[PDB]
Amino acid sequence: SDKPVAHVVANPEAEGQLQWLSRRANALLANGVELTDNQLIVPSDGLYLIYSQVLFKGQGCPSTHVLLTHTISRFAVSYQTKVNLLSAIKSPCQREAKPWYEPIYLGGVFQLEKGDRLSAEINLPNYLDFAESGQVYFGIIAL
Amino acid sequence: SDKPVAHVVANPEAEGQLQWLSRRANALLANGVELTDNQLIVPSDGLYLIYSQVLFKGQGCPSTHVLLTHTISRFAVSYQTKVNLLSAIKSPCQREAKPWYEPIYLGGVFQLEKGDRLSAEINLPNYLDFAESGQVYFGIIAL
Amino acid sequence: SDKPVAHVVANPEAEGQLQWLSRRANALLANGVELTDNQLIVPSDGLYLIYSQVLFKGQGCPSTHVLLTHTISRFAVSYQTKVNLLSAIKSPCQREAKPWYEPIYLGGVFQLEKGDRLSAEINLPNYLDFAESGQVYFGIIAL
Amino acid sequence: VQLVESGGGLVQPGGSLRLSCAASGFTFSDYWMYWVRQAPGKGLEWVSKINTNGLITKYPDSVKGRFTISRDNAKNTLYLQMNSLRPEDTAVYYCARSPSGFNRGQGTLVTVSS
Amino acid sequence: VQLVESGGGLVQPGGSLRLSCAASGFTFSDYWMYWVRQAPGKGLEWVSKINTNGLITKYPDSVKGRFTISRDNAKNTLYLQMNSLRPEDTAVYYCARSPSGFNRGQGTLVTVSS
Amino acid sequence: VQLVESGGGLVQPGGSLRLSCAASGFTFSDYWMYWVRQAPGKGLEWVSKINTNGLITKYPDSVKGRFTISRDNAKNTLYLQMNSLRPEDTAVYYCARSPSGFNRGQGTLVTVSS
Secondary structure, eight states: OOOOEEEEEEOSSOSSSOOEEOSSTTOEEETTOEEOSSOEEOSSOEEEEEEEEEEEEEESOOSSOOOEEEEEEEEOSSSOOOEEEEEEEEOOOSOOOOEEEEEEEEEEEEEEOTTOEEEEEESOGGGBOOSSSSSSEEEEEEO | OOOOEEEEEOOSSOSSSOOOBOSSTTOEEETTOEEOSSOEEOSSOEEEEEEEEEEEEEESOOSSOOOEEEEEEEEOSSSOOOEEEEEEEEOOOSOOOOEEEEEEEEEEEEEEOTTOEEEEEESOGGGBOOSSSSSSEEEEEEO | OOSOEEEEEEOSSOSSSOOEEOSSTTOEEETTOEEOSSOEEOSSOEEEEEEEEEEEEEESOOSSOOOEEEEEEOOOSSSOOOOEEEEEEEOOOOOOOOEEEEEEEEEEEEEEOTTOEEEEEESOGGGBOOSSSSSSEEEEEEO | OOOOEEOOEEOOTTOOOEEEEEOOSSOTTTSOEEEEEEOTTSOEEEEEEEOSSSOOEEOOTTTTTSEEOOEETTTTEEEEEEOSOOTTOOEEEEEESSTTOOOOOOOEEEEOOO | OOOOEEOOEEOOTTOEEEEEEEOOSSOTTTSOEEEEEEOTTSOEEEEEEEOSSSOOEEOOTTTTTSOOOOEETTTTEEEEEEESOOTTOOEEEEEESSTTOOOOOOOEEEEOOO | OOOOEEOOEEOOTTOOOEEEEEOOSSOTTTSOEEEEEEOTTSOEEEEEEEOSSSOOEEOOTTTTTSEEOOEETTTTEEEEEEOSOOTTOOEEEEEESSTTOOSOOOOEEEEOOO
16 A cells, blocks of 8 residues: 555466566556566666566577576666666586476665656577466566 | 564474474564464565575485476465466486585565465475575565 | 655666766665665664665586575674575576576565675676666665 | 365285375475375364475374475475375375365375275 | 777678677666667668677667677677678768667778778 | 594694694584684684685785695585694684684694694
8 A cells, every 4th residue: 555566467368578567366567567669667766676587498408508587777867877786697508308397586775766668578488388377577666 | 563473494303304483592473474384374465575594405316317396375354276486496406425505586566365375385295305494494574 | 754664776887896876867875875886874763675786698508517595694783793684595507699688686674783894795786687777776764 | 276186096905106286376396295095984184284395294104105296386396206005005095285274176086995 | 988990991792890888887688689880971870789698689780690799797898790792881980879869979981992 | 514624633843734624503504614723821823814716815924834724615614734743833712703713613733733
């Protein structure tokens, strides 16, 4: 109550992409936070806790080395830019049948103005795992 | 503090199992949250932050591929069910005496009613590592 | 406002070490929390949320097995000690020129008194990756 | 929200049956699923529990060792494998969302006649 | 806080031309970078987007397939490598912090004369 | 909450000693442990620091290179391995929970007579 909050989950009815949803059970979008074009808009300035998690899956391993990344970025309303808040890189292949799974989690506390837009992104959507529930998500809470 | 809160750790005096404890230093159980049969019970409806982390240790690697999982699940008081809130999967072995370690962390924000019961579970307790302190824990906070 | 908070990042202009900074954009130090000798100091007793993430990078793999660790530790003002609140261990190599990346994240909720000093530590600083932004950080927030 | 069941029959001791169940009306890739058994003249006891991603399995001690439970989330189905049957497993088996029985649309009888 | 550009010239169709850009006055290892193009008699569009660590790359469909963007954070620089050019790629190219154009101190003209 | 020390004696220069400590009354698998040394006629200085899981080790520059610290949490014990000693390392040694000295029940004397 009177506390902006959002917790969105990936879209399973999509392929090779990462679209957030808020029309699912056990998902949240309340008190002014809006999801417009795969982004969450801060409704009022203050301190926020921002978290996100993704899971990558792959059968076998590509011959070439592959690096996966998960980032969270901020768009300021004034002096329009795109700053990097939290980021991480992982590499699942050490050589060269069996599948492999890799999770990545990020979280932090930041001071944000009104109208700033946050966005969580990856680089190889074809490796993503949005099959089950609670394996990919992204959210913020005001406090 | 009128803020329900809990932070429990594993039980070292146990083998091949995962029992939470709240009678340790630097562990919390306050303001109505109850540990009843390896579960944390919400004392009042509202928004909660839920987190948990586990660590797996293994000597060598098995001949067969092994997949480890860590999940957090909710039991609703009405229409008794068990939905999945947060989950992750990892695989440490790729071929074929040195040991290996793998941590898994989960965290999120959810809206819960009164009397719903939360539970954090794994699948291969014999691979768990609870020797030291702060390597396995599970907790919630109200806000 | 009237809520102690800190979020510090690594020092890029340093080698083989880990110095936290609070004089950078998108970093926080407010309402009584002080950085004194690589340590944030609690300004008032109460519940706190503590988090920290680091990233290790390594070209190739050593001939000998290597184990990396990330810990967060307390320092009680009375009965001067150093307890371990959160910790994790990871092993990047499995056998035997491509580089590898490994992230580690920790977070929890703890009750702390006034004047306790928290510190986040690693064991192999020469493997650390502080080149980019948001790849290493450590922070606390009061509730 | 219908959970149909099938696979029933008569198995002489030492045989092997295999039940099955379907679901609809909800996101099948969320809830844990429970195989429950109601016996004539006895209580209603659960026989199997499985989680969302299918890597957590649970059996009672009276059944553990000769069973196997699985699922296929794409087709919204739940399985159960009968191995080395005994006269003690003579009852009606349902699939439910709760170990105590919940949303049992239909049932199927497994008789083990010696 | 200025970003100089270079690499301009004339490339006959089917050739390949590489640009370059510099930066100063800010932490170059934070912001995303955008290659934008302004054409005579047309609007201001964006041709490339890159993130902080250089593993996320985005192009429009009109350009995708024959471009390549990169950076080196140590020297505070931004790149672009046009291959197999066309008369449509005849315009002034800027490096900016926003895809719509922001802080483009200078410019460089690329013409594809057939 | 007592910590007994031992392993003392006389070592001719260039030798190798090895001290030891035990503990009780607290969870030994939690606290960092510190080897401190008090010299006759000087201040009290720490010689070694170790963390809970034993992968973080710290020495002063006056000692670094010739010592080795370790622990065993199952038996609630802490070690110290001495290499290539000098007359400067002639003092009493304690095991404690703080680098400045705290909860040192006893101390063991090490003399390096040349």
